[PDB]
Amino acid sequence: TRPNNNTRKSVRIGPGQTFYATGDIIGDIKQAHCNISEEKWNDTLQKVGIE
């Protein structure tokens, strides 16, 4: 997940084509991350160690 509520900003760059970018960040600034269940990872790494 990326929690930040980003905004789409468009910029005309040359005749008839648009460059895109992020505008203001809405809300509070937060950290992107990914979660894993601990015991499932322990079980996976233990079963992989068995082999």
Binding site: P3, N4, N5, G27, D28, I29, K30, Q31, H33
Partner: protein, 126 residues
């Protein structure tokens, strides 16, 4: 138990600016959002803005886009709101609140969990 004991009431006339400070005790200061809400004398209730006491990031009601700027001093445990360009319509009994807990992983700022409040100050723009 928990309290967010505000300052005393102080007033200036319309066109000037004023101040209110928002203390906290005994719980830690840097861990919950601090919210400011307004309750006008012959009206319902309003919202000023939310304060992130850790980083200082803030957002405010678009009615008060430039009129209000929020700040804090974590060592003291106090937060400041200063309302400018005053009018008689900016009379209220001003309240200060601890909002929700602060996580690094998701935005709890806009949660209206106005749990514990300040003891109130009667700012009649006189």
């Amino acid at each position: 138990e928990v309290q967010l004991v505000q300052s005393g009431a102080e007033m200036k006339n319309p066109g000037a600016s004023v101040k209110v400070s928002c203390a906290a005790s005994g719980y830690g200061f840097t861990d919950f959002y601090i919210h400011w809400v307004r309750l006008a004398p012959g009206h319902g209730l309003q919202w000023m803005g939310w304060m992130n006491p850790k980083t200082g990031r803030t957002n405010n009601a678009q009615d008060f886009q430039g009129r209000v700027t929020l700040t804090r001093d974590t060592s003291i445990g106090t937060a400041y709101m200063e309302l400018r360009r005053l009018t008689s319509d900016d009379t209220a009994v001003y309240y200060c609140v601890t909002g929700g807990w602060i996580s690094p992983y998701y935005d709890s700022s806009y949660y209206p969990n106005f749990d514990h409040w300040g003891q109130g100050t009667l700012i009649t723009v006189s």
